[PDB]
Amino acid sequence: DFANTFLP
Amino acid sequence: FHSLRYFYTAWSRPGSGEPRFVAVGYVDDTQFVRFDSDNASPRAEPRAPWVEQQDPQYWDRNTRNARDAAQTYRVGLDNVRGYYNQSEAGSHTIQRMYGCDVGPHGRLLRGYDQLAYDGADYIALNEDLRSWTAADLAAQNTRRKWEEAGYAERDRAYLEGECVEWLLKHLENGRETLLRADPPKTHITHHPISDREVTLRCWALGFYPEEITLTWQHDGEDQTQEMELVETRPDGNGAFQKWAALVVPSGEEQRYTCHVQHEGLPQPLTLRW
Amino acid sequence: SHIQRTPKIQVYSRHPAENGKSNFLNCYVSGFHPSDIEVDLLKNGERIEKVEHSDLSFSKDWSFYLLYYTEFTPTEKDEYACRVNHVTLSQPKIVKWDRDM
């Protein structure tokens, strides 16, 4: 699975 | 011993539509998944024969994850452009590289999550998987927000959890492709330039994984500074190529040997014309 | 684009070139930044119609790499080349195919 993506 | 690696690229195209987002995943040196936001109704798609048999919920789940990541970096591109106070008329890029290296025991060796902005380090998860290193002042903006939100803990849970478990599933489902060590097919070619000088080129073809060592020796003395060594390239079929060439006097070809080291070779190879 | 890098270019075939036998012509572009790039494969100076390319990825230093490839059958006097344009290049780069490289 892809990981969670965090808003810069 | 093995690694699961994901690469995200997001960039803006001022005047030419929304930003674009592309993601790819690899197990070691073999790609197995892609996502492209420029597709209409974009999906995460298999890019390896072995990963195809994965349950349909895997592809539905990762499609919604990738679409959400794409939306997040579209807004993120404006956030970071604003921190640097850059013009909206310029194109800029956010990249992300994350994954895990697993050892023989089936446990985490190292996890990582790094972002770049315009081709330079922006923020990176530290090796303790609990704190962030920001590369400049603008990246401190991101760093403060990610600390207060506690995102390092979500990274740690993924890297020490799902990442390892998914690397091991992929390794088993693609064992015949991923657990091979194909040696190179090696030969030397011979290209006369003049009556006194010729080019010797030592080839390594069709090998996997990408790591290889190619060297020329002149009566046993290394010739690295005299030789031309090209960067390792994909052959298009899931393997790699490389060569090293050397200009040699027209009667002295026999005094030179090429040496090839690679994982699939039981012993290192020595070739000579 | 703060840090920009011009691409390296290699043009080669998947298998060693034997005339009259089907092969693949490869143009490998690597080490560039940013990601937008124009790669064309030329036969005798004219762009080849069906050219595919790998999915965009990048290396440890964040520089991008792409493989462009097309099915082809090498002959003795047919000339093949790769034309690359990029924001770092004031003029396009054309690298000819050389079956010995």
Numbering used by the authors:
A (entry chain C): 1 to 8
B (entry chain A): 2 to 274
C (entry chain B): -1 to 99
Which passages does the manuscript contain on this structure?
Major histocompatibility complex (MHC) class I molecules (MHC I) present antigen peptides to the surface of antigen presenting cells (APCs) to active T cells through interaction with T-cell receptors (TCRs), which play pivotal roles in antiviral defense. The overall structures of Ptal-N*01:01 display the common characteristics of classical MHC I molecules in other mammals, with the extracellular region of the heavy chain folding into three different domains. The α1 and α2 domains construct a typical PBG that contains two α1-helices and eight β-sheets, and the α3 domain and β2m display typical immunoglobulin (Ig) domains and underpin the peptide binding domain.
Meanwhile, although the salt bridge was still observed between Arg65 of Ptal-N*01:01 and the P1-Asp, both the Arg65 and P1-Asp displayed a conformational shift. One of the hydrogen bonds between the two residues Arg65 (Residue Arg62 in the mutant) and the P1-Asp of HeV1 was lost, and the remaining two hydrogen bonds extended from 2.97 to 3.23 Å and 2.67 to 2.72 Å, respectively. CD spectroscopy also indicated a weaker binding of Ptal-N*01:01(-3aa) with the peptide. Either depletion of the three inserted residues (Met52Asp53Leu54) or substitution of the P1-Asp with Ala impaired the MHC/peptide binding. These data indicate that the 3-aa insertion into Ptal-N*01:01 leads to a more restrictive binding peptide selection for Ptal-N*01:01 but not an extension to longer peptides via the N terminus.
